mmCIF file of C-alpha atoms in Angstrom:
data_model
loop_
_atom_site.group_PDB
_atom_site.id
_atom_site.type_symbol
_atom_site.label_atom_id
_atom_site.label_comp_id
_atom_site.label_asym_id
_atom_site.label_seq_id
_atom_site.Cartn_x
_atom_site.Cartn_y
_atom_site.Cartn_z
ATOM 1 C CA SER A 16 -25.786 -12.551 25.637
ATOM 2 C CA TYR A 17 -23.698 -15.371 24.168
ATOM 3 C CA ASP A 18 -20.119 -16.412 23.366
ATOM 4 C CA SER A 19 -17.230 -14.143 24.368
ATOM 5 C CA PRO A 20 -17.510 -10.314 24.475
ATOM 6 C CA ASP A 21 -18.094 -8.599 21.132
ATOM 7 C CA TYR A 22 -14.546 -7.590 20.207
ATOM 8 C CA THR A 23 -15.658 -4.582 18.162
ATOM 9 C CA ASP A 24 -12.172 -3.062 18.142
ATOM 10 C CA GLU A 25 -10.587 -4.885 15.198
ATOM 11 C CA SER A 26 -12.976 -6.723 12.867
ATOM 12 C CA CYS A 27 -9.839 -7.235 10.791
ATOM 13 C CA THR A 28 -12.129 -8.479 8.041
ATOM 14 C CA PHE A 29 -11.025 -7.976 4.443
ATOM 15 C CA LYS A 30 -12.903 -8.423 1.171
ATOM 16 C CA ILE A 31 -11.735 -8.596 -2.410
ATOM 17 C CA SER A 32 -13.749 -7.562 -5.434
ATOM 18 C CA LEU A 33 -13.131 -8.065 -9.165
ATOM 19 C CA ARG A 34 -14.197 -5.040 -11.227
ATOM 20 C CA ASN A 35 -13.701 -5.571 -14.967
ATOM 21 C CA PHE A 36 -11.360 -8.430 -14.067
ATOM 22 C CA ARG A 37 -9.427 -6.025 -11.861
ATOM 23 C CA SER A 38 -8.558 -6.979 -8.306
ATOM 24 C CA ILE A 39 -9.344 -4.661 -5.419
ATOM 25 C CA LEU A 40 -9.086 -5.682 -1.818
ATOM 26 C CA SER A 41 -10.405 -3.830 1.179
ATOM 27 C CA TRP A 42 -10.405 -4.109 4.946
ATOM 28 C CA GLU A 43 -12.769 -3.784 7.867
ATOM 29 C CA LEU A 44 -10.943 -2.724 10.961
ATOM 30 C CA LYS A 45 -13.633 -1.604 13.378
ATOM 31 C CA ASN A 46 -13.049 1.332 15.728
ATOM 32 C CA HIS A 47 -13.533 1.077 19.498
ATOM 33 C CA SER A 48 -11.077 3.150 21.536
ATOM 34 C CA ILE A 49 -8.300 4.398 19.257
ATOM 35 C CA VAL A 50 -9.147 5.949 15.888
ATOM 36 C CA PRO A 51 -6.698 4.761 13.178
ATOM 37 C CA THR A 52 -6.734 6.792 9.965
ATOM 38 C CA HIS A 53 -3.861 5.556 7.793
ATOM 39 C CA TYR A 54 -3.320 1.911 6.893
ATOM 40 C CA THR A 55 -0.864 -0.253 4.978
ATOM 41 C CA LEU A 56 -2.128 -2.936 2.642
ATOM 42 C CA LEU A 57 0.510 -5.669 2.621
ATOM 43 C CA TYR A 58 0.118 -8.698 0.323
ATOM 44 C CA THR A 59 1.822 -11.919 -0.843
ATOM 45 C CA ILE A 60 1.149 -15.412 -2.256
ATOM 46 C CA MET A 61 0.535 -18.458 -0.041
ATOM 47 C CA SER A 62 3.316 -20.351 -1.853
ATOM 48 C CA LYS A 63 5.669 -17.501 -0.938
ATOM 49 C CA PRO A 64 4.435 -15.837 2.298
ATOM 50 C CA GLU A 65 7.885 -14.330 2.692
ATOM 51 C CA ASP A 66 7.324 -12.065 -0.317
ATOM 52 C CA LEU A 67 4.859 -9.555 1.155
ATOM 53 C CA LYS A 68 4.685 -6.016 -0.230
ATOM 54 C CA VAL A 69 3.385 -2.773 1.149
ATOM 55 C CA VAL A 70 1.654 -1.689 -2.041
ATOM 56 C CA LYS A 71 2.381 1.877 -3.126
ATOM 57 C CA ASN A 72 -0.464 4.281 -2.331
ATOM 58 C CA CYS A 73 -1.870 1.618 0.012
ATOM 59 C CA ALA A 74 0.720 2.124 2.779
ATOM 60 C CA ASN A 75 -0.048 4.602 5.592
ATOM 61 C CA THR A 76 -3.037 5.666 3.603
ATOM 62 C CA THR A 77 -5.977 7.384 5.157
ATOM 63 C CA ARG A 78 -8.258 5.372 3.016
ATOM 64 C CA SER A 79 -9.605 1.825 3.332
ATOM 65 C CA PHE A 80 -10.251 -0.122 0.109
ATOM 66 C CA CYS A 81 -6.978 -0.658 -1.762
ATOM 67 C CA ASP A 82 -6.900 -1.732 -5.424
ATOM 68 C CA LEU A 83 -4.789 -4.255 -7.338
ATOM 69 C CA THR A 84 -5.367 -4.940 -11.031
ATOM 70 C CA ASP A 85 -1.918 -6.203 -12.020
ATOM 71 C CA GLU A 86 -0.675 -6.654 -8.447
ATOM 72 C CA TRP A 87 -2.499 -9.958 -7.898
ATOM 73 C CA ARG A 88 -1.789 -11.630 -11.257
ATOM 74 C CA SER A 89 -1.301 -14.893 -9.353
ATOM 75 C CA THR A 90 -4.900 -15.896 -10.095
ATOM 76 C CA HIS A 91 -3.700 -19.470 -9.616
ATOM 77 C CA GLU A 92 -2.672 -18.662 -6.047
ATOM 78 C CA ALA A 93 -4.108 -17.614 -2.743
ATOM 79 C CA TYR A 94 -3.005 -14.020 -2.371
ATOM 80 C CA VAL A 95 -2.194 -14.038 1.308
ATOM 81 C CA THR A 96 -2.502 -10.465 2.489
ATOM 82 C CA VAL A 97 -1.356 -8.807 5.710
ATOM 83 C CA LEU A 98 -2.985 -5.443 6.197
ATOM 84 C CA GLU A 99 -1.064 -3.637 8.910
ATOM 85 C CA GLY A 100 -2.827 -0.553 10.189
ATOM 86 C CA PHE A 101 -1.131 1.939 12.467
ATOM 87 C CA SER A 102 -3.375 4.190 14.526
ATOM 88 C CA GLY A 103 -2.098 7.648 13.640
ATOM 89 C CA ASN A 104 1.638 7.205 14.195
ATOM 90 C CA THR A 105 1.584 3.920 16.148
ATOM 91 C CA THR A 106 0.985 0.352 15.024
ATOM 92 C CA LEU A 107 -2.384 -0.740 16.224
ATOM 93 C CA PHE A 108 -2.767 -3.960 14.259
ATOM 94 C CA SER A 109 -1.457 -6.375 11.631
ATOM 95 C CA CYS A 110 -3.933 -8.908 10.250
ATOM 96 C CA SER A 111 -3.598 -11.330 7.361
ATOM 97 C CA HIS A 112 -5.813 -13.577 5.254
ATOM 98 C CA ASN A 113 -5.306 -16.147 2.503
ATOM 99 C CA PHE A 114 -7.215 -14.682 -0.437
ATOM 100 C CA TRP A 115 -8.454 -17.561 -2.560
ATOM 101 C CA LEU A 116 -8.951 -15.791 -5.894
ATOM 102 C CA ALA A 117 -8.708 -18.829 -8.162
ATOM 103 C CA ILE A 118 -11.417 -20.288 -5.918
ATOM 104 C CA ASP A 119 -13.252 -17.078 -4.928
ATOM 105 C CA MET A 120 -12.868 -14.610 -7.823
ATOM 106 C CA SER A 121 -15.581 -12.096 -6.872
ATOM 107 C CA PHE A 122 -17.148 -10.603 -9.997
ATOM 108 C CA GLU A 123 -19.927 -7.997 -9.805
ATOM 109 C CA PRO A 124 -19.007 -4.400 -10.849
ATOM 110 C CA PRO A 125 -19.236 -5.304 -14.606
ATOM 111 C CA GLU A 126 -22.236 -3.969 -16.525
ATOM 112 C CA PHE A 127 -25.111 -6.267 -17.486
ATOM 113 C CA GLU A 128 -28.576 -6.054 -18.968
ATOM 114 C CA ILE A 129 -31.197 -8.314 -20.300
ATOM 115 C CA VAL A 130 -33.842 -7.450 -22.830
ATOM 116 C CA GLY A 131 -36.747 -9.841 -22.986
ATOM 117 C CA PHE A 132 -38.728 -10.580 -26.104
ATOM 118 C CA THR A 133 -42.294 -11.878 -26.106
ATOM 119 C CA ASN A 134 -40.929 -15.386 -26.864
ATOM 120 C CA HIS A 135 -37.225 -15.167 -25.882
ATOM 121 C CA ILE A 136 -34.576 -13.590 -23.667
ATOM 122 C CA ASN A 137 -31.737 -11.311 -24.703
ATOM 123 C CA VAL A 138 -29.031 -11.288 -22.054
ATOM 124 C CA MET A 139 -25.961 -9.088 -22.376
ATOM 125 C CA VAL A 140 -23.145 -9.217 -19.860
ATOM 126 C CA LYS A 141 -20.884 -6.245 -20.254
ATOM 127 C CA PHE A 142 -17.349 -7.392 -19.386
ATOM 128 C CA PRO A 143 -14.380 -5.057 -20.094
ATOM 129 C CA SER A 144 -12.903 -4.984 -23.586
ATOM 130 C CA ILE A 145 -10.074 -7.514 -23.306
ATOM 131 C CA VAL A 146 -8.481 -10.012 -25.675
ATOM 132 C CA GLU A 147 -8.614 -13.345 -23.831
ATOM 133 C CA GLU A 148 -5.688 -14.313 -26.076
ATOM 134 C CA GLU A 149 -3.657 -12.458 -23.427
ATOM 135 C CA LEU A 150 -5.830 -13.379 -20.452
ATOM 136 C CA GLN A 151 -4.322 -15.483 -17.647
ATOM 137 C CA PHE A 152 -7.828 -16.331 -16.416
ATOM 138 C CA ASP A 153 -9.494 -19.738 -16.540
ATOM 139 C CA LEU A 154 -12.961 -18.910 -15.241
ATOM 140 C CA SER A 155 -16.399 -19.085 -16.808
ATOM 141 C CA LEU A 156 -19.532 -17.030 -16.433
ATOM 142 C CA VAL A 157 -22.903 -18.199 -15.232
ATOM 143 C CA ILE A 158 -26.040 -16.598 -16.605
ATOM 144 C CA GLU A 159 -28.740 -17.485 -14.065
ATOM 145 C CA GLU A 160 -32.270 -17.263 -15.505
ATOM 146 C CA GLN A 161 -35.077 -16.761 -12.958
ATOM 147 C CA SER A 162 -38.078 -16.359 -15.270
ATOM 148 C CA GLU A 163 -41.637 -16.371 -13.933
ATOM 149 C CA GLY A 164 -40.563 -18.324 -10.847
ATOM 150 C CA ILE A 165 -38.272 -20.686 -12.751
ATOM 151 C CA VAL A 166 -34.666 -20.527 -11.588
ATOM 152 C CA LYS A 167 -31.813 -21.594 -13.848
ATOM 153 C CA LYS A 168 -28.033 -21.353 -14.040
ATOM 154 C CA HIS A 169 -26.534 -20.905 -17.498
ATOM 155 C CA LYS A 170 -22.784 -21.272 -18.001
ATOM 156 C CA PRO A 171 -21.890 -20.141 -21.555
ATOM 157 C CA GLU A 172 -18.384 -20.622 -22.920
ATOM 158 C CA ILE A 173 -16.444 -17.511 -21.935
ATOM 159 C CA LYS A 174 -13.727 -18.283 -24.488
ATOM 160 C CA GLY A 175 -13.879 -14.728 -25.787
ATOM 161 C CA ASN A 176 -17.189 -13.726 -24.213
ATOM 162 C CA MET A 177 -15.709 -11.870 -21.226
ATOM 163 C CA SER A 178 -14.387 -9.105 -23.509
ATOM 164 C CA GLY A 179 -17.240 -6.606 -23.837
ATOM 165 C CA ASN A 180 -20.981 -6.917 -24.479
ATOM 166 C CA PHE A 181 -21.412 -10.626 -23.703
ATOM 167 C CA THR A 182 -24.320 -11.863 -25.800
ATOM 168 C CA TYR A 183 -26.521 -14.691 -24.489
ATOM 169 C CA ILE A 184 -30.129 -15.512 -25.427
ATOM 170 C CA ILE A 185 -32.438 -17.406 -23.090
ATOM 171 C CA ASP A 186 -35.061 -18.914 -25.347
ATOM 172 C CA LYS A 187 -37.550 -21.792 -25.212
ATOM 173 C CA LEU A 188 -39.966 -19.803 -23.054
ATOM 174 C CA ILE A 189 -43.619 -18.770 -23.244
ATOM 175 C CA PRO A 190 -44.937 -15.160 -23.112
ATOM 176 C CA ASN A 191 -45.089 -13.435 -19.710
ATOM 177 C CA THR A 192 -41.691 -14.462 -18.357
ATOM 178 C CA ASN A 193 -40.246 -11.894 -15.958
ATOM 179 C CA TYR A 194 -36.751 -13.232 -15.266
ATOM 180 C CA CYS A 195 -34.127 -12.066 -12.851
ATOM 181 C CA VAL A 196 -30.849 -12.669 -14.663
ATOM 182 C CA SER A 197 -27.748 -12.803 -12.494
ATOM 183 C CA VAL A 198 -24.153 -12.829 -13.644
ATOM 184 C CA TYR A 199 -22.046 -15.049 -11.399
ATOM 185 C CA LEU A 200 -18.846 -16.847 -12.425
ATOM 186 C CA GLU A 201 -17.846 -20.465 -11.847
ATOM 187 C CA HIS A 202 -14.357 -21.924 -11.472
ATOM 188 C CA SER A 203 -15.144 -25.513 -10.487
ATOM 189 C CA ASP A 204 -17.689 -25.526 -7.659
ATOM 190 C CA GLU A 205 -21.190 -24.488 -6.591
ATOM 191 C CA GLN A 206 -19.827 -22.238 -3.854
ATOM 192 C CA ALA A 207 -18.262 -19.572 -6.084
ATOM 193 C CA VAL A 208 -21.665 -18.065 -6.862
ATOM 194 C CA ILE A 209 -21.056 -14.356 -7.169
ATOM 195 C CA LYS A 210 -24.706 -13.874 -8.079
ATOM 196 C CA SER A 211 -24.941 -10.119 -8.526
ATOM 197 C CA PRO A 212 -28.267 -8.264 -8.090
ATOM 198 C CA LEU A 213 -30.318 -9.877 -10.828
ATOM 199 C CA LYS A 214 -32.108 -8.125 -13.586
ATOM 200 C CA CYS A 215 -35.812 -8.918 -13.768
ATOM 201 C CA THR A 216 -36.643 -8.106 -17.398
ATOM 202 C CA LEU A 217 -40.114 -9.245 -18.514
ATOM 203 C CA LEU A 218 -41.501 -9.902 -22.024
ATOM 204 C CA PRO A 219 -44.871 -8.836 -23.471
ATOM 205 C CA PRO A 220 -46.956 -11.157 -21.297
ATOM 206 C CA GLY A 221 -49.222 -13.162 -23.526
ATOM 207 C CA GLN A 222 -51.801 -13.519 -20.747
ATOM 208 C CA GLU A 223 -54.287 -11.307 -22.590
ATOM 209 C CA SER A 224 -57.909 -12.192 -23.381
ATOM 210 C CA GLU A 225 -58.933 -15.541 -24.868
ATOM 211 C CA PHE A 226 -60.915 -16.136 -28.058
ATOM 212 C CA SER A 227 -61.052 -18.413 -31.104
#
């Protein structure tokens, strides 16, 4: 019992996710009274809010999460999006949001593993096969190493590392080092931490017996 009534009839909350450096934005329009099925994902760029587009296949669509790999190439812009959802045949809502990709860039879907050796770590971040030489990105990757209780944030040069089986090795460690390795990117702040579900790969723990 606090604040105003729980307006659970239009959460109008949208989220964007970057799968293999592909943009995909979704929406969260809660249902209370009317039951809207089809929606229309409309998007634009903050610098030009007058250039909104009802993306094909994302207009009156009885689906929710709409994709956009080459539709939001303005990585250096805040893709302002207006998702207008009509309940059945009538317009029931029209909400917008300034998507800060350049500042948010949510990366997670990509594949990633980490094999740990008795005395070292073998981290492999599986980013899509792409030739950065034609990449409009300007983001890095952060290999966070949480071994045996020790948390760390690695940020290897992604100048050609975000194009397949990223290869990083966390060394300078002693046997028995179970580390949860996350794969979050960094643009220029400590708030863009898309720390995906880590990977806790251990090494042959050298905590065996003890003799001469």
